[PDB]
């Protein structure tokens, strides 16, 4: 009966959770926190707020939600991408293991969700805040799904430029739109800045893909080891199909499929994209055109310190 | 000019997502759907609705939300537990890879969350369903994190029977309580009696202890993957704390060594089992523990837990 009394007191109570248990399972998350770039995701929110005007207490919460979602996404992305480093540091799953990292990352998504309720007391608004959160996280998982599928089942599907851009609108545009849509919904205060935040996500991503190869040609071109269907690689694959460069098209697939860390093999692929397909110049120029679409936006049809961010978008 | 036009169209529209795309991402999930148990998790929902009386359309969505969370939880748990099999079938991550499986599973978490807003249009009630959904998924992750922590840090921390039971209230109680708390908040029924959460908690507990018990018993009588996983099973927690108390130092260490082996070796697995069989009598202890738990419900004449 002391057993039953114990079982009885157990089931008539909320589940026990100590602050100690909380520390033990937050290890993978505390590790990625030791990484920079933070002050920048914070500079973008701060700038957009000059327009949205939410009180600083609400802006702090919007910011905590996004940081939890962002860092958790990277903890996961690194398992998904077999990444050994993130922001010059050893990846969490390599230290604590994939099991703990996945669980903790998923855990933080729900803490993030929890915080949405500290943004309002109003039910109509709260319901909309949750829908935005739910929607963009659904979008993030969709693009991430395609990026991962194209790569892992290559050459089953060779994405075209169009397909890549759609994948990026979901994948990368997910959190960008999330942050902005929350702010536009909490604003006490012109046209929606969503097309502009979308163009930013796109630029951010093609730039991430591009710089990952160009800095090795001049990091470690880890994208090649991953086998990622990046902007430069998507152009090269399609370009070779179109110009009938069979041998080169196949060599590109062969190298991607090696998941190689050999610097010379990676450098060969890059030099193929440089001189054979001209995928690097194409990408650098595609980036510039997108940036000009904003820099030449006088009539403010995209646009509402703003541009300073566009050139330091790599540090977010 | 034409490139700028295309980008303009793109950024002014919602992200494009086709049904073929939906089919691609769904592959790891669909693969697990070829699995039984469904006419039983759904059986419990049915039964309890006899007291809750939710209108079918609403009950089905609950059934849907529960199914997505459960199947998704299993996809991830198998990755976390390095499980090669689930219901006799090759686990999803061994077929589609860990990357796609993790992504798909999480996606389904959010799809499940989406179904929550289609349970009701009343803004007060909806908020409660979300808080419910949110709270239990958090407990689920807390328990899972602890079950994984003990295992992966062994032998840093060896839980006591009590710590184990608390871990289970979180991990396994989560989905059980989420299912019932939703149904109770939706119930059109005036006063369907005392809340059934205490009863669903005891159920969750019996369920997990029995799961750990059966993993070893169906191997002592004839794969015992919990040993290969190195899991702090209910019988294992009992054996470890039983040898520590009876000062049986060498048996205590032998148990730890085998769990730390992460072994698939039949002989060695048989060896750990014979220790629990003859040395600590942990399997008989577990069987009896389960029976006591059940008797709490069987001899519930004043219906304190039962409806
Ligand atoms: C969930 C998101 C948006 C992260 C995607 O990152 P990528 O795998 O595309 O590249 P890195 O962020 O690791 O540079
Ligand atoms: C959460 C635990 C311990 C078991 C999960 O699987 P079930 O016992 O519910 O069985 P199936 O859903 O896989 O049929
Ligand atoms: C997320 C939950 C609740 C499933 C936990 O199942 P276990 O980790 O106990 O392992 P299985 O025996 O169910 O495979
Ligand atoms: Mg990555
Ligand atoms: Mg990635
Ligand atoms: Mg398991
Ligand atoms: Mg498990």
Curated annotation (Swiss-Prot), chain B:
Isopentenyl diphosphate binds at residues 38, 41, 70, 87. It holds the Pfam family polyprenyl_synt. The keyword Membrane does not apply. Its main location: cytoplasm. It is an enzyme of class 2 (transferase). One of its GO terms (cellular component) is mitochondrion. Keywords: Carotenoid biosynthesis, Cytoplasm, Isoprene biosynthesis, Magnesium, Metal-binding, Protein transport, Transferase, Transport. InterPro entries: Isoprenoid_synthase_dom_sf, Polyprenyl_synt, Polyprenyl_synt_CS. It comes from the Eukaryota. Its cofactor is Mg(2+). It catalyses: isopentenyl diphosphate + dimethylallyl diphosphate = (2E)-geranyl diphosphate + diphosphate; isopentenyl diphosphate + (2E)-geranyl diphosphate = (2E,6E)-farnesyl diphosphate + diphosphate; isopentenyl diphosphate + (2E,6E)-farnesyl diphosphate = (2E,6E,10E)-geranylgeranyl diphosphate + diphosphate. Present with 2840 molecules/cell in log phase SD medium. PANTHER family: GERANYLGERANYL PYROPHOSPHATE SYNTHASE. Catalyzes the trans-addition of the 3 molecules of IPP onto DMAPP to form geranylgeranyl pyrophosphate. Required for the membrane attachment of YPT1 and SEC4. May be involved in vesicle trafficking and protein sorting. This is Geranylgeranyl pyrophosphate synthase BTS1. It comes from Saccharomyces cerevisiae (strain ATCC 204508 / S288c). The gene is BTS1.
């Amino acid at each position: 009966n002391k057993m039953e009394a114990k079982i009885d007191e157990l089931i008539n109570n909320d589940p026990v959770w100590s602050s100690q248990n909380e520390s033990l399972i937050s290890k993978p998350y505390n590790h990625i926190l030791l990484k920079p770039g933070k002050n920048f995701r914070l500079n973008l929110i701060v700038q957009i707020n000059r327009v949205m005007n939410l009180p600083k207490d609400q802006l702090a919460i919007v910011s905590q939600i996004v940081e939890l979602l962002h860092n958790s996404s990277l903890l996961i992305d690194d398992i998904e991408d077999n990444a050994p480093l993130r922001r010059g540091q050893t990846t969490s799953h390599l230290i604590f293991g994939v099991p703990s990292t996945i669980n903790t990352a998923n855990y933080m998504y729900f803490r993030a969700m929890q915080l949405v309720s500290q943004l309002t007391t109003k039910e109509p608004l709260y319901h909309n805040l949750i829908t935005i959160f739910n929607e963009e996280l659904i979008n993030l998982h969709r693009g991430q799904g395609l990026d991962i599928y194209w790569r892992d089942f290559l050459p089953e599907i060779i994405p075209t430029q169009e397909m890549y851009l759609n994948m990026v609108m979901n994948k990368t545009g997910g959190l960008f739109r999330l942050t902005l849509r929350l702010m536009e919904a909490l604003s006490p205060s012109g046209h929606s800045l969503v097309p502009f935040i979308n163009l930013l996500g796109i630029i951010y991503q093609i730039r991430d893909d591009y710089l990952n190869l160009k800095d090795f040609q001049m990091g470690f071109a880890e994208d090649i080891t991953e086998g990622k269907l990046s902007f430069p690689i998507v152009h090269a694959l399609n370009f070779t199909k179109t110009k009938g460069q069979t041998e080169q098209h196949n060599e590109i697939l062969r190298i991607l499929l090696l998941r190689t860390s050999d610097k010379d093999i990676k450098l060969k692929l890059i030099q193929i994209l440089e001189f054979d397909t001209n995928s690097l110049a194409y990408t650098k120029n595609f980036i510039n055109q997108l940036v000009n679409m904003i820099k030449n936006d006088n009539e403010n049809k995209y646009l509402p310190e703003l541009l300073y961010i566009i050139d330091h978008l790599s540090e977010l």
